[PDB]
Amino acid sequence: MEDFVRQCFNPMIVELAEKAMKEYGEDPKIETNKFAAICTHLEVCFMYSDGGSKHRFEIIEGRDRIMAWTVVNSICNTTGVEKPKFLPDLYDYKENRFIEIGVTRREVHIYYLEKANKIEKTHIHIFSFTGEEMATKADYTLDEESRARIKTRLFTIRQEMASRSLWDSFRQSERAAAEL
Ligand SMILES: COCCNC(=O)c1nc([C@@H]2CCCN2C(=O)COc2ccccc2)[nH]c(=O)c1O
Ligand SMILES: [Mn+2]
Ligand SMILES: [Mn+2]
């Protein structure tokens, strides 16, 4: 999986993922499913912002967690949006709401229900590796072409992993994390 990740993701994304794991005391060379999951989620967050104008989004994911909370506080202080209890992935400057992005190897609606349970003003948008998506109130934020690019990328990743016999382990690892 190490070779797959370094071959299919931008070096900057790989390095941010390595950094994140090291800060959490994890080895990218050992927890390789997590390594790929982090890369995939960060890439999706970048592709999501590309779906709006350059004025539309603040990307919160992939930044120093301590500093990210100060940006969240500045947004909440200036816009009057309620402060989220959990650090989100994006802020939408147009709709003035935070966004939580889910990327799951599980079923999109089960994942949505759990995320919603764990989260009230944050908008939730879930993507799968099988071309499915789910979003709060069926409000998908982006146009269909921007979302098609995301779904297509994730579908492509699943096929590439499957051809290297990595998909089944990657799939099961999200469920093992949920079981524990
Ligand atoms: C990880 O803790 C630092 C802040 N966590 C996030 O921001 C975040 N966490 C997760 C899931 C649920 C709780 C922990 N976790 C994972 O370890 C899965 O892998 C990821 C790790 C980081 C980013 C994306 C995926 N799911 C997301 O969608 C997400 O945005
Ligand atoms: Mn996040
Ligand atoms: Mn997320």
Author numbering: 1 to 53, 73 to 138, 141 to 201
Source paper text:
The influenza virus RdRp is a heterotrimer that includes the polymerase catalytic subunit (PB1), the ‘cap-binding’ subunit (PB2), and the endonuclease-containing (PA) subunit.
Initial diamide compounds such as 6e (general structure 6: R1 = phenoxyacetyl, R2 = 2-methoxy ethylamine) showed relatively weak activity in the FP assay (Ki = 1.6 μM), but compounds such as 6f (general structure 6: R1 = 2, 6-dichlorobenzoyl, R2 = 2-phenethylamine) showed improved binding (Ki = 0.36 μM) for the amide series, although the potency was generally not as high as the corresponding carboxylate analogs.
